[PDB]
Ligand binder design. Structure first.
Ligand SMILES: [Zn+2]
Length: 258
């Protein structure tokens, strides 16, 4: 069968259909905070999400994606390590069966309960499908989630998950503000990597924020109630949909902060 997160179709198997799995710039990675170097020539990140136009939420059998209208520069990321303008197309998360695992990136081997990815494409390539084939085609803003107090900006997401329980279900999801998912600080690490799901393309500039957001136990519990399977198929809970840390292979991780 096709790719997943189980014993039989999970990350150890991906390289047979996607040989770039064993490539030179795979993600995620462990961020060693002692080895990352402060890079004085990194600009502050510019997250311009005021005109973000959310459309839909979809269970794609791997995660759920909240999709945005990316036909114009309505919600963009720029600055930081980036040249040019990257448009927000979707966000999703990765999460664990337990609070001690679920992030894809780790920080000195520490795993967080979950990780949010805000996926952007480089507008100089005109569309997302062309952008994913270029080495500077994508920029993913990664945010760690720890369990603590509730994140009020996440609750609208939590509330709709009932309606997209199984693979292929979608719901209308307009007027959601992705600014409510950000922590206070935009301090970050950055390195060149890849998509963390098949087809594992090596087209991502990763920007991983130093400050986690806190979500509540009840919020993450709702994520764990989703299903990987389709309606009418045997229930497999959507948990542990993360890829483990890949070798760094002499890439340098840079910090925006001292
Ligand atoms: Zn992701």
């Amino acid at each position: 069968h096709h790719w997943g997160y189980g014993k039989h179709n999970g990350p150890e198997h991906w390289h047979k259909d996607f040989p770039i799995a064993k490539g030179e710039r795979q993600s995620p990675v462990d961020i060693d905070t002692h080895t990352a170097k402060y890079d004085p020539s990194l600009k502050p990140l510019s997250v311009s999400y005021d005109q973000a136009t959310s459309l839909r939420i979809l269970n794609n059998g791997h995660a759920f994606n909240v999709e945005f209208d990316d036909s114009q520069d309505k919600a963009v990321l720029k600055g930081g390590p980036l040249d040019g303008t990257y448009r927000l197309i979707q966000f999703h998360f990765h999460w664990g069966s337990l609070d001690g695992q679920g992030s894809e990136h780790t920080v000195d081997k520490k795993k967080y309960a979950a990780e949010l990815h805000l996926v952007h494409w480089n507008t100089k390539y005109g569309d997302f499908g062309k952008a994913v084939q270029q080495p500077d085609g994508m920029a993913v803003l990664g945010i760690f989630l720890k369990v603590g107090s509730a994140k009020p900006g996440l609750q609208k997401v939590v509330d709709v998950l009932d309606s997209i329980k199984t693979k292929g279900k979608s719901a209308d999801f307009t007027n959601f503000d992705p600014r409510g998912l950000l922590p206070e600080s935009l301090d970050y690490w950055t390195y060149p990597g890849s998509m963390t799901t098949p087809p594992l393309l090596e087209s991502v500039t990763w920007i991983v924020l130093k400050e986690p957001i806190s979500v509540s136990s009840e919020q993450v519990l709702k994520f764990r109630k989703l299903n990987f399977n389709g309606e009418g198929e045997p229930e497999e809970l959507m948990v542990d949909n993360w890829r483990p840390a890949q070798p760094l292979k002499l890439r340098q991780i840079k910090a925006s902060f001292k």
